[PDB]
Amino acid sequence: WPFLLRFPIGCFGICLGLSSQAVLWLALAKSPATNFLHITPLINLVVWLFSLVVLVSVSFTYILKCIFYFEAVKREYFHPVRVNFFFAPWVVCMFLAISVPPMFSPNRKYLHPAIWCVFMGPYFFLELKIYGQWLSGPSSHLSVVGNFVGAILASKVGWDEVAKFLWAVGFAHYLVVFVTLYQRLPTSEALPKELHPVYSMFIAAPSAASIAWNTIYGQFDGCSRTCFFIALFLYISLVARINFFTGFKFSVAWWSYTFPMTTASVATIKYAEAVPGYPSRALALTLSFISTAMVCVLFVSTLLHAFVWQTLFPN
Amino acid sequence: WPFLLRFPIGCFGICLGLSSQAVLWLALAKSPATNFLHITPLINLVVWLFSLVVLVSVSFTYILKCIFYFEAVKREYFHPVRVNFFFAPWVVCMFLAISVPPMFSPNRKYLHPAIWCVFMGPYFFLELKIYGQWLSGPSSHLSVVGNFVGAILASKVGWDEVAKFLWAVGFAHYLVVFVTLYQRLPTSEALPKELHPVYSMFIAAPSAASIAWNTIYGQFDGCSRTCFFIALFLYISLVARINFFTGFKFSVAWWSYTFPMTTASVATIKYAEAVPGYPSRALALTLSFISTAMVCVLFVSTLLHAFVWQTLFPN
Amino acid sequence: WPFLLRFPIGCFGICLGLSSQAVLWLALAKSPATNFLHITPLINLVVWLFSLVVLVSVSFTYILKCIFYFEAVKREYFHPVRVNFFFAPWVVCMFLAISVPPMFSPNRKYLHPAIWCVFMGPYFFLELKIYGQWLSGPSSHLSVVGNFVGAILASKVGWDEVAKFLWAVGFAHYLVVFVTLYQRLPTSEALPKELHPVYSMFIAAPSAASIAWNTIYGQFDGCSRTCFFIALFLYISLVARINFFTGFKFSVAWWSYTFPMTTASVATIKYAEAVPGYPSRALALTLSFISTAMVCVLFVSTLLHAFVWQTLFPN
Ligand SMILES: CC(C)CCC[C@@H](C)[C@H]1CC[C@H]2[C@@H]3CC=C4C[C@@H](OC(=O)CCC(=O)O)CC[C@]4(C)[C@H]3CC[C@]12C
Ligand SMILES: CC(C)CCC[C@@H](C)[C@H]1CC[C@H]2[C@@H]3CC=C4C[C@@H](OC(=O)CCC(=O)O)CC[C@]4(C)[C@H]3CC[C@]12C
Ligand SMILES: CC(C)CCC[C@@H](C)[C@H]1CC[C@H]2[C@@H]3CC=C4C[C@@H](OC(=O)CCC(=O)O)CC[C@]4(C)[C@H]3CC[C@]12C
Ligand SMILES: [Cl-]
Ligand SMILES: [Cl-]
Ligand SMILES: [Cl-]
Ligand SMILES: [Cl-]
Ligand SMILES: [Cl-]
Ligand SMILES: [Cl-]
């Protein structure tokens, strides 16, 4: 059993969670509402560099597999559940782009338009091609989160009009996913094993949509508030449904679940700036504290379970 | 056959219809657009007291059954069609709360926040628990109307922010219900017998949503108008589809159908205040006249059929 | 085989495409953004008269069949796929009404209210009756486009309030159609033959809705922009999915596909007026050029294939 076979596409899950952490701490240092913490922006410098190293190493190793064992890649593509992970490498690169650590880049009004085109295009072509396969042969193949994220990148460039077009496309696909998935949610028992990639974008897409609305227009309306509150209601359902009595075991799939929690925390900070008050401030800090704590303990657990015991990679 | 067995949970239907009548006549006396009628506010005083008596008597008798024959209550819970009626006792109490007869309460800016918490919480816990049962074992178990009604109560207290959160949650559940129920509407023949509790909230939830929007913001927009017009279009479909040639017979289920009609009438009065004109005024009065007439004739019929013949309660 | 049997209801398809062309060229002559072309309004005079001749001839011949062979009409009604075409004669008359060639009518603020009632009523009665048949015996029987078109006619009369009511009804039916049709789109192979009437209103209803919003309110908002962008995204999917390598053959069904393209072009012109700029202007002209070119080449092809070879009408 060579190492290439035991290396699946699920490795990209860890990069998405860690990269999403970078945007959270950037806000905590550039938030006028949360100025009283005096958080040093140097934290983002370490986190952003760490996200680049893991993304390059993961991507480079996977490229070697694609030339060495193309047939293995071909087999993975067809399987229905693990298809969504093909979108993961493209969407994560956009997350680093919006971070854009202040120290590296001298102050400028907008980023160069060339950056948007290179990252965005491979995603749009993949979205249409993967959608066509479903018709030839649920509706879980559709990608929703990436379109909302691209709108944020487009707003940073300054192309306001195209950002509105991407938001409309992302919303339309959400309706089909929302109706089907809500009817049959996964059972509390054996939650991580079943439909783990698909579920993550169910508690995350609304929170991303609210952030995109704030960048395009600049003022909160019913779109940003209601989408944010829907995500909060869905997030609360996890606590009530999860069984505290039932035991839990370590699994690689836990890395993907981190990403939904982080996106909600960033969205809450936007709400606090628009509407000041003691309620919002405490709620924003609480969500951030839970998100960052889970990553730190999970990072230690996934580090020990891979080195001394080499149980991270199954046969 | 003891009286406890022949006493079902459908008795709560009559309370919902009569309690909804109270809010209608309160508006008719406090509407600047309909000032020319000079309606005495004393009508609400009689109606509100009458609603309290029936609600207490119905609730007190049912509590006796729950301790005497718990297993009978347990059997009723599982059956799919008659599950929605468990939400009915909680939602109706909120309807009396908004009425708040002026004579009883000295003029005050807002009501005490404690009233909102006691009534609302048992409903939110019930909504999550009942929804979980569906996943373990359509989508008719979901409750939609109560969330919109709670927003009205929250606005009366003055907690504007939480009212927006409840409205978002209620809207999201409506999408699943609207798609499924619209595909298979009940046939005109044997209309009352089939799916009678579920259908009532289909012509009623839009009208409640429009009222909630007016209280939170204060100015009509596309939300209030389009939701109100959707309810009107759905209400008109009943007249066209119902068969006049086919005969009708007395049934206990008719009490639930009163509640949808009353809610639409109250919503129309809001429209008349925002947009004045002869068209709206006549339409508002016509809907109220039909609603109040149906209750009076139905009340007499349900009174005679229960006393001289004792045919109200089946075996 | 008498000519009456070989004359189907699909003949009304050609009238819808040609009549829709009339509104496009009217805008091109009355558009301040596209003033630099100096397009003579005389083009609409020829087109509008040509649309009236074909509509009268098609309608008059079909009336003869309805009295001669009523049973044949009765058989056609039941078949599920070819039911939507019954709505086509009524909706097309509204399209000529909005055109209202300037030369014929002296300048006036609004049109007489009587015109709206005569055309609209037969459509509303048909919508309710056809919808009832589905319940007694997908959800493709529902009509969506006509309600949005009627709102435009109502706005021309000046009855603003009723136009909002029609828009709400049309939107509600769209949700059921959008969810069902999007799940199972037709395959690229043998595209014209399968579900040809139903598909045409899928790329067309959003574009009609955006135009109606602009007339009722007068200022673009998120309704007009997002609905327009959804239609653009759906239109682009046709180019990617269609197979260029696969050959194509002449068919009568191609006339219906013209109508979706024209409606999108008219909607784009509205966008250019609201938001000026070089991007929008070129995109508006390009869509119009493709639409008008397709009609001209198709008109020649459908003319030659019917006269020398008499292959237009199948047995
Ligand atoms: C794909 C995800 C990100 C969104 C899924 C949710 C949408 C299907 C629905 C939920 C409720 C709907 C909203 C209902 C109420 C409003 C407020 C409505 O009225 C306003 O104009 C708000 C601002 C104001 O004028 O005060 C604007 C659109 C919006 C947000 C609606 C847009 C579509 C929403 C967000
Ligand atoms: C759960 C029930 C109560 C609502 C179900 C209906 C909604 C799914 C849809 C129907 C049409 C949609 C509306 C379409 C048009 C508008 C107007 C739109 O534009 C405006 O800003 C209106 C006010 C103005 O700016 O003039 C605001 C949101 C809204 C109401 C939309 C919100 C979501 C609505 C109400
Ligand atoms: C039946 C067809 C014609 C429409 C099908 C699409 C609708 C189901 C959804 C898609 C996204 C929704 C929209 C989402 C965002 C908005 C913007 C929202 O916010 C605004 O107030 C826009 C204007 C502004 O205030 O800047 C108003 C309603 C609207 C258009 C929503 C109404 C309902 C929409 C159009
Ligand atoms: Cl940001
Ligand atoms: Cl996705
Ligand atoms: Cl009220
Ligand atoms: Cl309910
Ligand atoms: Cl026009
Ligand atoms: Cl249609």
Side-chain angles (χ1 to χ4, degrees), chain A residues 1-70 72-74 77-102 104-106 110-186 190-192 194-218 220-244 247-248 250-314, chain B residues 1-70 72-74 77-102 104-106 110-186 190-192 194-218 220-244 247-248 250-314, chain C residues 1-70 72-74 77-102 104-106 110-186 190-192 194-218 220-244 247-248 250-314:
Chain A
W1 275 90
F3 182 76
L4 279 295
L5 321 183
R6 45 179 66 261
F7 193 19
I9 207 164
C11 65
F12 268 108
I14 185 170
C15 287
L16 261 172
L18 192 151
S19 166
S20 302
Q21 295 297 109
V23 73
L24 182 63
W25 281 77
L26 161 73
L28 265 294
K30 302 317 201 150
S31 167
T34 316
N35 189 359
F36 63 92
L37 292 189
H38 302 47
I39 301 173
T40 307
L42 215 56
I43 299 306
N44 191 301
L45 189 57
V46 170
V47 173
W48 195 82
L49 273 44
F50 198 50
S51 193
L52 190 64
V53 175
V54 291
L55 177 59
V56 169
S57 296
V58 161
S59 179
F60 191 80
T61 317
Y62 199 47
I63 293 169
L64 276 169
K65 189 183 124 186
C66 295
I67 62 170
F68 265 50
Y69 296 125
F70 194 80
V73 179
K74 195 191 154 270
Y77 186 59
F78 294 171
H79 187 273
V81 175
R82 183 183 292 168
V83 75
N84 277 330
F85 279 117
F86 264 76
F87 280 119
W90 294 113
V91 65
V92 75
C93 311
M94 278 161 181
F95 264 100
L96 292 91
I98 67 173
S99 168
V100 58
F104 286 141
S105 164
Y110 299 113
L111 302 168
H112 204 284
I115 294 306
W116 178 76
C117 164
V118 58
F119 285 169
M120 186 70 219
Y123 174 95
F124 195 17
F125 194 168
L126 212 61
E127 185 175 275
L128 291 192
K129 204 193 72 53
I130 196 171
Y131 173 37
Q133 296 295 11
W134 159 250
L135 284 64
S136 287
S139 81
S140 296
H141 296 176
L142 291 162
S143 180
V144 54
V145 58
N147 316 80
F148 292 133
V149 169
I152 299 161
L153 185 52
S155 191
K156 295 295 186 291
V157 181
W159 294 358
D160 268 344
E161 320 285 315
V162 300
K164 298 180 178 180
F165 157 65
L166 290 180
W167 200 90
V169 176
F171 175 87
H173 286 184
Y174 187 71
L175 295 185
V176 180
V177 169
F178 184 75
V179 167
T180 300
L181 277 296
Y182 206 86
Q183 183 87 348
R184 66 221 63 187
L185 278 188
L191 186 63
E194 48 201 3
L195 61 84
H196 90 266
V198 19
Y199 193 74
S200 51
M201 279 55 71
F202 190 61
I203 301 94
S207 308
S210 82
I211 304 179
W213 208 250
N214 187 49
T215 67
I216 294 169
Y217 286 171
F220 272 16
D221 281 66
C223 295
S224 188
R225 289 170 190 258
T226 52
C227 289
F228 170 55
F229 279 121
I230 285 177
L232 284 180
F233 159 67
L234 273 173
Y235 188 33
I236 295 296
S237 175
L238 273 297
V239 167
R241 282 201 43 213
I242 198 168
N243 189 359
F244 286 143
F248 273 66
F250 182 76
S251 87
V252 177
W254 293 126
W255 269 108
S256 179
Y257 278 137
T258 291
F259 154 68
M261 292 135 68
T262 290
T263 300
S265 310
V266 193
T268 301
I269 305 156
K270 304 273 165 276
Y271 191 93
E273 296 163 317
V275 165
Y278 272 41
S280 179
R281 181 184 64 83
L283 190 142
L285 266 65
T286 301
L287 294 174
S288 310
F289 182 76
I290 307 301
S291 73
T292 187
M294 191 84 182
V295 187
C296 166
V297 64
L298 183 92
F299 199 78
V300 176
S301 62
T302 192
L303 211 59
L304 302 195
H305 273 299
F307 286 7
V308 290
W309 301 305
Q310 293 82 17
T311 59
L312 185 67
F313 282 74
Chain B
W1 275 90
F3 182 76
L4 279 295
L5 321 183
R6 45 179 66 261
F7 193 19
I9 207 164
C11 65
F12 268 108
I14 185 170
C15 287
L16 261 172
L18 192 151
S19 166
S20 302
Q21 295 297 109
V23 73
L24 182 63
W25 281 77
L26 161 73
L28 265 294
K30 302 317 201 151
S31 167
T34 316
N35 189 359
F36 63 92
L37 292 189
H38 302 47
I39 301 173
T40 307
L42 215 56
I43 299 306
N44 191 301
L45 189 57
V46 170
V47 173
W48 195 82
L49 273 44
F50 198 50
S51 193
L52 190 64
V53 175
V54 291
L55 177 59
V56 169
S57 296
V58 161
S59 179
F60 191 80
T61 317
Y62 199 47
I63 293 169
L64 276 169
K65 189 183 124 186
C66 295
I67 62 170
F68 265 50
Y69 296 125
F70 194 80
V73 179
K74 195 191 154 270
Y77 186 59
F78 294 171
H79 187 273
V81 175
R82 183 183 292 168
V83 75
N84 277 330
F85 279 117
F86 264 76
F87 280 119
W90 294 113
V91 65
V92 75
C93 311
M94 278 161 181
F95 264 100
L96 292 91
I98 67 173
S99 168
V100 58
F104 286 141
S105 164
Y110 299 113
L111 302 168
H112 204 284
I115 294 306
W116 178 76
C117 164
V118 58
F119 285 169
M120 186 70 219
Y123 174 95
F124 195 17
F125 194 168
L126 212 61
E127 185 175 275
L128 291 192
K129 204 193 72 53
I130 196 171
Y131 173 37
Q133 296 295 11
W134 159 250
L135 284 64
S136 287
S139 81
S140 296
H141 296 176
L142 291 162
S143 180
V144 54
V145 58
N147 316 80
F148 292 133
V149 169
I152 299 161
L153 185 52
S155 191
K156 295 295 186 291
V157 181
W159 294 358
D160 268 344
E161 320 285 315
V162 300
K164 298 180 178 180
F165 157 65
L166 290 180
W167 200 90
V169 176
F171 175 87
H173 286 184
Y174 187 71
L175 295 185
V176 180
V177 169
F178 184 75
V179 167
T180 300
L181 277 296
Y182 206 86
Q183 183 87 348
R184 66 221 63 186
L185 278 187
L191 186 63
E194 48 201 4
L195 61 84
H196 90 266
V198 19
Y199 193 73
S200 51
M201 279 55 71
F202 190 61
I203 301 94
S207 308
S210 82
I211 304 179
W213 208 250
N214 187 49
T215 67
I216 294 169
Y217 286 171
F220 272 16
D221 281 67
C223 295
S224 188
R225 288 170 190 258
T226 52
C227 289
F228 170 55
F229 279 121
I230 286 177
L232 283 180
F233 159 67
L234 273 173
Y235 188 33
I236 295 296
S237 175
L238 273 297
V239 167
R241 282 201 43 213
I242 198 168
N243 189 359
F244 286 143
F248 273 66
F250 182 76
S251 87
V252 177
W254 293 126
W255 269 108
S256 179
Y257 278 137
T258 291
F259 154 68
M261 293 135 68
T262 290
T263 300
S265 310
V266 193
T268 301
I269 305 156
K270 304 273 165 276
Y271 191 93
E273 296 163 317
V275 165
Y278 272 41
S280 179
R281 181 184 64 83
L283 190 142
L285 266 65
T286 301
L287 294 174
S288 310
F289 182 76
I290 306 301
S291 73
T292 187
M294 191 84 181
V295 187
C296 166
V297 64
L298 183 92
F299 199 78
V300 176
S301 62
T302 192
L303 211 59
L304 302 195
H305 273 299
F307 286 7
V308 290
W309 301 306
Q310 293 82 17
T311 59
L312 185 67
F313 282 74
Chain C
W1 275 90
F3 182 76
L4 279 295
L5 321 183
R6 45 179 66 261
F7 193 19
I9 207 164
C11 65
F12 268 108
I14 185 170
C15 287
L16 261 172
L18 192 151
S19 166
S20 301
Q21 295 297 109
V23 73
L24 182 63
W25 281 77
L26 161 73
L28 265 294
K30 302 317 201 151
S31 167
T34 316
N35 189 359
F36 63 92
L37 292 189
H38 302 47
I39 301 173
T40 307
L42 215 56
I43 299 306
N44 191 301
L45 189 57
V46 170
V47 173
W48 195 81
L49 273 44
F50 198 50
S51 193
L52 190 64
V53 175
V54 291
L55 177 59
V56 169
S57 296
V58 161
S59 179
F60 191 80
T61 317
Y62 199 47
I63 293 169
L64 276 169
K65 189 183 124 186
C66 295
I67 62 170
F68 265 50
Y69 296 125
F70 194 80
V73 179
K74 195 191 154 270
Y77 186 59
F78 294 171
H79 186 273
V81 175
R82 183 183 292 168
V83 75
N84 277 330
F85 279 117
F86 264 76
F87 280 119
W90 294 113
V91 65
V92 75
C93 311
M94 278 161 181
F95 264 100
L96 292 91
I98 67 173
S99 168
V100 58
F104 286 141
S105 164
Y110 299 113
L111 302 168
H112 204 284
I115 294 305
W116 178 76
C117 164
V118 58
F119 285 169
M120 186 70 219
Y123 174 95
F124 195 17
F125 194 168
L126 212 61
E127 185 175 275
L128 291 192
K129 204 193 72 53
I130 196 171
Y131 173 37
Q133 296 295 12
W134 159 250
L135 284 64
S136 287
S139 81
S140 296
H141 296 176
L142 291 162
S143 181
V144 54
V145 58
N147 316 80
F148 292 133
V149 169
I152 299 161
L153 185 52
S155 191
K156 295 295 186 291
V157 181
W159 294 358
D160 268 344
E161 320 285 315
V162 300
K164 298 180 179 180
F165 157 65
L166 290 180
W167 200 90
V169 176
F171 175 87
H173 286 184
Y174 187 71
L175 295 185
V176 180
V177 169
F178 184 75
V179 167
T180 300
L181 277 296
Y182 206 86
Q183 183 87 348
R184 66 221 63 186
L185 278 187
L191 186 63
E194 48 201 4
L195 61 84
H196 90 266
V198 19
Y199 193 74
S200 51
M201 279 55 71
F202 190 61
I203 301 94
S207 308
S210 82
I211 304 179
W213 208 250
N214 187 49
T215 67
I216 294 169
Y217 286 171
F220 272 16
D221 281 67
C223 295
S224 188
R225 288 170 190 258
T226 52
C227 289
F228 170 55
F229 279 121
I230 285 177
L232 283 180
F233 159 67
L234 273 173
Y235 188 33
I236 295 296
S237 175
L238 273 297
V239 167
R241 282 201 43 213
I242 198 168
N243 189 359
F244 286 143
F248 272 66
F250 182 76
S251 87
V252 177
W254 293 126
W255 269 108
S256 179
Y257 278 137
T258 291
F259 154 68
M261 293 135 68
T262 290
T263 300
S265 310
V266 193
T268 301
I269 305 156
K270 304 272 164 276
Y271 191 93
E273 296 163 317
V275 165
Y278 272 41
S280 179
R281 181 184 64 83
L283 190 142
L285 266 65
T286 301
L287 294 174
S288 310
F289 182 76
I290 306 301
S291 73
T292 187
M294 191 84 181
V295 187
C296 166
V297 64
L298 183 92
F299 199 78
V300 176
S301 62
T302 192
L303 211 59
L304 302 195
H305 273 299
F307 286 7
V308 290
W309 301 306
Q310 293 82 17
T311 59
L312 185 66
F313 282 74

